[PDB]
């Protein structure tokens, strides 16, 4: 699934070069924020210390993300 395919997804839920660039940048933002959520999940996984990023780590990452944004 391409980053421009993520832009296509955001286009499908949202609704030509200028709009193309706008939607590509929106896809960049969505991808970066997904990466941020996963990175904060890894950070929470560091606090607990077991093998892998169990689901409540992504959960806690989302609450911290909302509490800071």
């Amino acid at each position: 699934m391409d980053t421009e395919a993520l832009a296509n997804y955001l286009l499908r839920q949202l609704s030509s070069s200028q709009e193309y660039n706008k939607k590509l940048l929106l896809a960049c933002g969505f991808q970066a924020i997904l990466r941020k959520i996963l990175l904060d999940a890894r950070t929470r996984a560091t606090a607990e210390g077991l093998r892998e990023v169990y689901p409540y780590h992504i959960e806690a990452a989302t609450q911290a993300f909302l509490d800071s944004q």
């Binding site: 699934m1 391409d2 980053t3 421009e4 993520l6 997804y9 839920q13 070069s17 200028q18 709009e19 193309y20 660039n21 706008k22 939607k23 590509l24 940048l25 929106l26 960049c28 933002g29 969505f30 991808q31 970066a32 924020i33 997904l34 990466r35 941020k36 959520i37 996963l38 990175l39 999940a41 890894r42 093998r51 892998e52 990023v53 169990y54 689901p55 409540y56 780590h57 992504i58 959960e59 989302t62 909302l66 800071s68 944004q69």
Partner: protein, 92 residues
């Protein structure tokens, strides 16, 4: 509800991201990221209700992802296929 995005698509996207930082994900973790992607998308629609270059750089700065437009097209370079980030550079 038609909003959800597939778990396999998230797997394919995050596989490349694992190389920049190796996140390892059990199953229910995949299901929770898929479920909370809906909340993330709604929160983004709140944060970004309309698309503009100044608007998107300001939104991503507010998000803490970047510090300036320089960081913004650095992110675009590291997140987009080669020709595209040049196309966006023409837009900035």
């Amino acid at each position: 509800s038609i909003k959800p995005l597939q778990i396999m698509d998230l797997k394919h996207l995050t596989r490349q991201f694992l190389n920049e930082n190796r996140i390892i994900l059990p199953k229910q973790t995949w299901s929770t990221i898929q479920e909370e992607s809906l909340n993330i998308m709604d929160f983004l629609k709140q944060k970004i209700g309309t698309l503009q270059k100044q608007e998107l750089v300001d939104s991503f700065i507010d998000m803490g992802i970047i510090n300036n437009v320089d960081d913004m097209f650095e992110l675009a370079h590291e997140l987009l296929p080669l020709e595209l980030q040049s196309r966006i550079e023409s837009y900035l």
